Amino acid sequence: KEELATRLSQAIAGGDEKAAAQVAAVLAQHHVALNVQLMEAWFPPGPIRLQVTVEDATSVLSSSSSAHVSLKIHPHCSIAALQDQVFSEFGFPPAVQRWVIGRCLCMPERSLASYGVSQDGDPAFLYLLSAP
Amino acid sequence: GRQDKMRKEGLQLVSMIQEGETAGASPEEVFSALQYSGTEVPLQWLRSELSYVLEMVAELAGQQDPELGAFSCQEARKAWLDRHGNLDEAVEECVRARRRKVHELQSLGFGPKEGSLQALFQHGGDVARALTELQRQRLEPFHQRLWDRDPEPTPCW
Amino acid sequence: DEKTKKAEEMALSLARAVAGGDEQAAIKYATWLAEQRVPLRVQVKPEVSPTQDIRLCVSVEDAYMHTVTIWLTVRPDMTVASLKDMVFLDYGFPPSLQQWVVGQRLARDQETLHSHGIRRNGDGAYLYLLSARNT
């Protein structure tokens, strides 16, 4: 499994399509659960200081800015890893975090970069649910 | 600069999430509705339109892999929502989730022929609850023997 | 993001194809990525945290020599008393007649499954079922 995984990225980094197909098909037949990540180096560099505005069911929204929290985090980071960092520093499990960046509710699997995060001061919203 | 617009856009969506939660809609319901329909009134859309979309997700799932039995609304919904209202992805995942679960139940003793498809449908795609139901017959005779004459003596460890 | 965006989408789609058993889609995304010589970290997801569902291979024997293997769904941080209740709720064997053993060692109501070596899918335990006539 774990060698087929290695062999998969070797085959893709290799330019070798047929070897990538034979190994990707075999992992598929076995339903192997993979993390497939791009290189950190391909992303806009960090850590970046993300401006987080926390909100809930009854909080009074306003274009008043005031990020409650700044977090240093790399753009290559998955939203799942932002949720793990936030669970560490502050106690709120992933199950109650919902992340909004720009127009999007974010998927855990996707990078911060993929939602446009790349500069210091960039704004993200942490919506905390009240009945998981 | 563009930071200003990201803050505005975010707030605009947090606002609808906020309205949604207080009416009993999860943020992935509200957003899935927004992405699929462009509706200005996501709560209304969910009440009136959702079930027709989930109905479609289940039939298309059945069409794409007809070996996999029949898909439940709980499975259609979960797929619809994990893919944020993308129909073609939701169908892909509805099929994939059920395929993956049949492959597990198979490796644990319980293939299509011993009722895995029916039990997965019966329990909204819940592998844990299907496994329970499928092994009931295995434990019944253990239940039925408990009061039989002359058991072996209580082992010590 | 350049079309680093695109390469991520494809990577994530490859992961979903593979996990969902979609052989032809796994081939497509692997093919598109290999052809772009994209350098990737590809790893098997770690086996779950102690607050997550795993499948336990339980050997069951009763007071009448009968044996059978069943599969339970547990979380390793759950206690033996919580296990007992699960098996009572599901199949009706009262906690009082369940004797759990892992090692040669009778587990106790307070001890976690984690405490006893149970951590991944496929791990094992022995349930001994006592007769209602055992004194």
Q: Cα dist. B16→A54, A60, B126, C55 in Å?
A: 15, 13, 30, 40
The first and second tokens of residue B71, run together, are 């898909």
Check CB contact of C92 with chain B, cutoff 8 Å.
Answer: yes
Contact B142 C73 (CB under 8 A): no
On whether the CB atoms of residues C61 and C129 are closer than 8 A, the answer is yes
What amino acid occupies position C30?
A: A
| C34 Cβ contact partners less than 8 Å away, ≥ 6 residues apart | A11, A12, A14, A15, A16, A17, A19, A20
Check CB contact of A118 with chain C, cutoff 8 Å.
Answer: yes
Q: Cα dist. C37→A11, A15, A16, C40, C93 in Å?
A: 9, 5, 8, 9, 58
Beta bridge partners of C71: C57
- Say what the resolution is, in angstroms: 2.4
For A21, nearest residue in chain C (alpha carbons): C27
Contact A38 C8 (CB under 8 A): yes
Taking a contact as any Cβ pair under 8 Å apart, which residues of chain C between 44 and 73 contact chain B?
53, 55, 60, 62-66, 68, 70-71, 73
Beta bridge partners of C126: C59, C101
Task: Give contacts of C14 with chain A, Cβ < 8 Å.
Answer: 24, 34, 36
Q: B3, B8, B15: which to substitute to probe chain A, counting the most A Cβ within 10 Å?
A: B3
The first and second tokens of residue A1, run together, are 């499994």
Four-CA torsion A100, A58, B79, B84, nearest 10 degrees: -30
Beta-carbon count within 10 A of A127 CB: 23
**Sequence ranges of the domains in chain A:** 1-44, 45-132
DSSP string, B64-87: H-GGG-PPPHHHHHHHHHHTTT-H
Q: Domains plus CATH for chain B?
A: 8-137 (1.10.8.10)
Beta bridge partners of A36: C42
The first and second tokens of residue B51, run together, are 């079930």
Give the DSSP H or E segment for A70. strand A69-73
For B152, nearest residue in chain C (alpha carbons): C63
Q: Which of B105, B12, B96, B18 is nearest to B61 (CA)?
A: B96
For B139, nearest residue in chain C (alpha carbons): C91
Beta bridge partners of A97: A128
**Class of A45-132 in CATH:** alpha beta
Taking a contact as any Cβ pair under 8 Å apart, which residues of chain C between 75 and 134 contact chain A?
none
Check CB contact of B47 with chain A, cutoff 8 Å.
Answer: no
Q: Which of B131, B152, B153 sits opposite C65 (nearest CB)?
A: B152
Check CB contact of B7 with chain A, cutoff 8 Å.
Answer: yes
Q: Which of B97, B138, B149 sits opposite C70 (nearest CB)?
A: B138
For B6, nearest residue in chain A (alpha carbons): A102
How was this structure obtained? Answer: X-ray
Contact B151 C60 (CB under 8 A): no
- Minimal C-alpha gap between B83 and chain A (Å): 9
Beta bridge partners of C112: C79
Can you state the percent helix, strand and coil of chain C, rounding each to 5? 35, 25, 40
Give the DSSP H or E segment for C98. strand C98-101
Contact B153 C134 (CB under 8 A): yes
For A125, nearest residue in chain B (alpha carbons): B10
Cα–Cα dist A6/A23, whole Å: 10
Going by the DSSP 8-state scheme, the letter that residue A81 receives in this structure is: H
Contact C22 B96 (CB under 8 A): yes
Contact C64 B141 (CB under 8 A): no
Q: Which of C45, C108, C119, C42 is nearest to C77 (CA)?
A: C119
For B26, nearest residue in chain A (alpha carbons): A129
Q: Which of A113, A108, A125 is nearest to A69 (CA)?
A: A125
Q: Which of C82, C60, C92, C58 is nearest to B140 (CA)?
A: C92
Give the DSSP H or E segment for C73. strand C67-74
